[PDB]
Amino acid sequence: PWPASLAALALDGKLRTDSNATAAASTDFGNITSALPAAVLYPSSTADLVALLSAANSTPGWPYTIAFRGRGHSLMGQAFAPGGVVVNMASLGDAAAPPRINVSADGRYVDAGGEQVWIDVLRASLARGVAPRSWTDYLYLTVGGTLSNAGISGQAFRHGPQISNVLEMDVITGHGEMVTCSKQLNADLFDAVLGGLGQFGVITRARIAVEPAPARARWVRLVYTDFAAFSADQERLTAPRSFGPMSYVEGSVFVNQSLATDLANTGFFTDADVARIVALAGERNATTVYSIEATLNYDNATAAAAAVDQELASVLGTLSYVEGFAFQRDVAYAAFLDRVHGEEVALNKLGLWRVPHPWLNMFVPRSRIADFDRGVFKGILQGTDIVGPLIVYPLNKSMWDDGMSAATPSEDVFYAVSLLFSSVAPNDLARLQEQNRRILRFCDLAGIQYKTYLARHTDRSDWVRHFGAAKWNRFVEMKNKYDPKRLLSPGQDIFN
Numbered sequence: 001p002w003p004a005s006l007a008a009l010a011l012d013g014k015l016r017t018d019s020n021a022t023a024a025a026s027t028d029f030g031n032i033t034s035a036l037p038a039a040v041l042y043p044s045s046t047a048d049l050v051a052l053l054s055a056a057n058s059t060p061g062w063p064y065t066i067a068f069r070g071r072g073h074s075l076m077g078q079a080f081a082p083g084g085v086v087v088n089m090a091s092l093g094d095a096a097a098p099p100r101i102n103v104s105a106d107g108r109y110v111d112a113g114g115e116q117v118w119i120d121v122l123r124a125s126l127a128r129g130v131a132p133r134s135w136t137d138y139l140y141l142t143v144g145g146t147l148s149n150a151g152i153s154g155q156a157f158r159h160g161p162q163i164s165n166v167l168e169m170d171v172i173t174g175h176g177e178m179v180t181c182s183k184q185l186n187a188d189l190f191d192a193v194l195g196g197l198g199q200f201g202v203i204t205r206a207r208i209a210v211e212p213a214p215a216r217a218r219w220v221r222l223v224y225t226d227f228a229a230f231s232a233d234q235e236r237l238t239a240p241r242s243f244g245p246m247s248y249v250e251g252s253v254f255v256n257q258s259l260a261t262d263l264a265n266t267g268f269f270t271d272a273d274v275a276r277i278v279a280l281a282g283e284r285n286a287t288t289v290y291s292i293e294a295t296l297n298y299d300n301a302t303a304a305a306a307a308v309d310q311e312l313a314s315v316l317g318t319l320s321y322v323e324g325f326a327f328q329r330d331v332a333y334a335a336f337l338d339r340v341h342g343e344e345v346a347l348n349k350l351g352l353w354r355v356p357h358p359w360l361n362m363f364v365p366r367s368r369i370a371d372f373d374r375g376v377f378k379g380i381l382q383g384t385d386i387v388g389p390l391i392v393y394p395l396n397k398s399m400w401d402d403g404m405s406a407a408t409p410s411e412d413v414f415y416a417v418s419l420l421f422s423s424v425a426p427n428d429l430a431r432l433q434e435q436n437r438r439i440l441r442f443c444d445l446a447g448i449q450y451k452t453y454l455a456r457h458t459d460r461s462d463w464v465r466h467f468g469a470a471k472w473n474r475f476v477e478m479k480n481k482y483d484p485k486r487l488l489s490p491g492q493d494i495f496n
C-alpha cells in the first residue's frame with residue numbers, strides 16, 4: 001500500500017520511472033561510477049519531500065534508498081540511489097514564486113533554498129549590496145551539496161569553510177519531520193548535518209552569513225622554485241594576527257614535464273610570463289614550480305586604487321617569492337569568484353570537461369606538508385603529463401567546529417590538497433586511479449595523518465579512521481536518531 005501523499009506525487013507526474021529520468025540521475029561529474037535508481041522525484045515544494053520521507057519512515061520494510069541530487073558534482077556516486085529514489089533538488093526552484101533566495105532586511109544574511117546554486121546566491125546578494133564570505137572555487141554547486149561536505153576555497157583560512165558561515169537551517173529528517181535548527185535550537189541536528197554527507201536529512205533552507213560586497217579584487221600570483229619558501233609564505237599570509245589583509249589565498253604546483261602547458265592553461269599568465277617562468281625553472285634546475293594565488297578585495301572609492309597598490313606593495317615586501325615574479329590582474333569581484341566557469345565552458349566544447357575525474361582531495365597536517373611535497377610533487381608525480389590543477393594551500397583549524405560532522409587533522413594548521421586530474425587522454429584512467437592509491441599508500445607508510453575529503457570509502461574500518469573512533473560513535477548515534485533505516489545518501493557507502 002502507498003500513502004495518500006505518496007500516491008499523489010505519482011499522479012502529478014512528480015515520480016518518474018522512465019529511462020530518461022533515471023538515466024540522467026545515474027551519472028555524476030566523476031564520470032567513473034554509475035548506478036540507475038528505481039525512480040526520480042521532481043518536488044515542487046518541501047511538502048513533497050515530507051511526503052516521500054514520511055512514507056518511507058512509516059512503511060515497514062520500505063526498500064528504497066533516497067539521495068538528494070544537487071548538481072551532481074560528486075566524484076564517486078555519492079549522489080546516486082541504486083535501485084532507489086533520487087530527488088531532483090533543482091525542481092524546488094522552478095516555480096517563479098515564492099523566491100528561493102531572500103536577503104535579510106538588515107543585510108546581515110541571506111536565506112537560500114538547499115537546491116539553489118551558489119552562483120545565483122551570489123547574484124541575488126550582490127543586487128542587495130552584500131555577499132557570502134566563504135566560497136568554493138566553482139560556483140555551480142548547490143547550497144545543500146557544499147554544506148553537506150564543507151565548502152572550501154581561498155577564504156576559509158580567515159572565515160572558515162562554508163559550514164562555519166551558517167546561522168540556521170530547515171531540515172527534513174529521515175523520519176520525515178520538518179525541523180529548523182541552529183546552535184541554539186536542535187543543535188544536535190545542526191551539527192550533524194553540516195558536513196554530514198546527506199546522511200541525516202535534506203537541507204531545504206540555509207541561512208548564510210554575508211558581508212558588504214566588495215566591488216573589485218586585486219588578483220596576484222607569486223612564483224617560487226623553493227617549496228620551503230612557498231609554504232612559509234602561504235602560512236605567513238594566512239596566520240592569525242585578526243588576519244592579514246589578503247581576502248583569498250591558494251597555491252598551485254606545476255610539475256616540470258608539463259610546465260609551459262600548465263602555466264598557459266591557468267588563464268592567468270600571458271605567453272611572455274610563461275617564457276620567463278620556464279626559463280627560471282631551467283636556471284634553478286627545478287623539477288617543480290610553485291605559485292601563490294591571492295586577492296585583496298576593495299570598493300570603488302576614489303582613493304581605493306592607490307590604497308590597494310600601497311597595501312599590496314607592503315604585503316609583498318614581507319614575502320620571499322623570486323625577485324620580479326609577482327603578477328597582477330585587477331577585476332570585478334563577481335568576475336573573480338566565477339573564474340572557473342570560464343574554464344568549464346571552454347573545455348566542455350573541446351569535449352574535455354565531461355571526462356573521467358579521478359580527483360584526489362585531502363587535508364595534510366602542516367608538519368608533514370614538506371614530506372608530502374617530496375614524496376608526491378617531486379616524486380610520484382614526476383615523469384607524467386599533468387592536465388588539471390594541483391592546488392595546495394593552508395587552513396586554520398580554529399575556524400573549523402569539530403562538533404560538526406566534517407573531519408579534519410588535529411594540527412592547528414593543515415593544508416587542503418586538491419589534485420584535479422583529468423583522464424583527458426584515452427583509457428588513461430586506470431593509471432590515474434592506481435597513482436592515487438600509490439599516493440595514499442605513500443602517506444600511510446610515512447605516517448602522515450591525513451584526512452580525505454570529497455571521497456567515499458567502501459570499507460567500514462576506513463570510515464571509522466576518517467572520523468576518528470569517538471567522533472564515529474557520535475556519527476552513529478546521530479544516524480540512529482535521524483535516519484535509523486539507513487536510507488539517505490547511500491552513495492556515501494557509510495551505512496550502505
Ligand SMILES: *[C]C1=C([C])[C]=C2N=[C@@]3(C(=[C])[C]/[C]=N/C4=C5[N][C]=NC5=N[C]=N4)C(=O)[N]C(=O)N=C3N([C][C]([O])[C]([O])[C]([O])[C]OP([O])(=O)OP([O])(=O)O[C][C]3O[C](N4[C]=NC5=C4N=[C]N=C5[N])[C]([O])[C]3[O])C2=[C]1
Nearest residue numbers: 068070071072073074114137138142144145152198202203
Ligand atoms: C564538479 C566540481 C567542480 C568543477 C569544482 C569543485 N570545487 C571544489 C573543489 C574540489 C575544488 C575544485 N577546484 C577547481 C578549480 N580551481 C581552479 N580551477 C579549477 N577547476 C576545477 N576545479 C571547491 O572549490 N571546494 C570544495 O569544497 N568542493 C568543490 N567541489 C566539490 C563539491 O563541493 C561537491 O561535489 C558537493 O557535493 C556539492 O556538489 P553538488 O552537485 O551541489 O551536490 P551532489 O554531488 O549532487 O550531492 C552531494 C551529496 O550531498 C547530498 N545532498 C545534496 N543536496 C543536499 C544533500 N544533502 C542534504 N541536503 C541537500 N540539499 C547528496 O545526497 C550527496 O550525498 C567541486 C566539484
Ligand SMILES: *[C@@H]1O[C@H](CO)[C@@H](O[C@@H]2O[C@H](CO)[C@@H](O)[C@H](O)[C@H]2NC(C)=O)[C@H](O)[C@H]1NC(C)=O
Nearest residue numbers: 256281282283284285286287288378379382383
Ligand atoms: C638537476 O636536477 C636533476 C633532477 O632533480 C638532477 O638529476 C638527478 O640526479 C640524481 C643524483 O645524481 C639522480 O639520482 C637522479 O636520478 C637524477 N634525476 C633523474 C631521475 O634524472 C641533476 O643532478 C641536477 N643537476 C645538477 C647536477 O645539479
Ligand SMILES: *[C@@H]1O[C@H](CO)[C@@H](O[C@H]2O[C@H](CO)[C@@H](O)[C@H](O)[C@H]2NC(C)=O)[C@H](O)[C@H]1NC(C)=O
Nearest residue numbers: 255256257258259278281282284285286287288
Ligand atoms: C624539464 O622537462 C623537460 C621536458 O619538457 C626536460 O627536457 C629538456 O632536457 C632534455 C634532456 O636534455 C632535452 O632532451 C629536452 O629537449 C629539453 N626540453 C626543454 C625543456 O627545452 C628538462 O630536462 C626537465 N628539467 C628538469 C630539471 O627535470
Ligand SMILES: *[C@H]1O[C@H](CO)[C@@H](O[C@@H]2O[C@H](CO)[C@@H](O)[C@H](O)[C@H]2NC(C)=O)[C@H](O)[C@H]1NC(C)=O
Nearest residue numbers: 097098099100101102103110111112113205206
Ligand atoms: C524568503 O522570503 C519569502 C518571502 O516571504 C518566502 O516566501 C514565502 O514562501 C512560503 C513557502 O516557502 C509561501 O507559503 C509564502 O506564500 C511565500 N511568501 C509570499 C511571497 O507570499 C520564502 O519562502 C523565503 N525563502 C527563503 C530564501 O528562505
Ligand SMILES: *[C@@H]1O[C@H](CO)[C@@H](O)[C@H](O)[C@H]1NC(C)=O
Nearest residue numbers: 027028031032033034354355
Ligand atoms: C562518462 O561520460 C561519457 C560522456 O558523457 C558517457 O558516455 C559515459 O556513459 C559516462 N560514464 C559514466 C561511468 O558515467
Ligand SMILES: *[C@H]1O[C@H](CO)[C@@H](O)[C@H](O)[C@H]1NC(C)=O
Nearest residue numbers: 129214215216299300301332
Ligand atoms: C562601483 O563602480 C564600478 C564601476 O562603475 C561598478 O562596476 C561597481 O558595481 C560599483 N559598485 C557599487 C557601488 O555597486
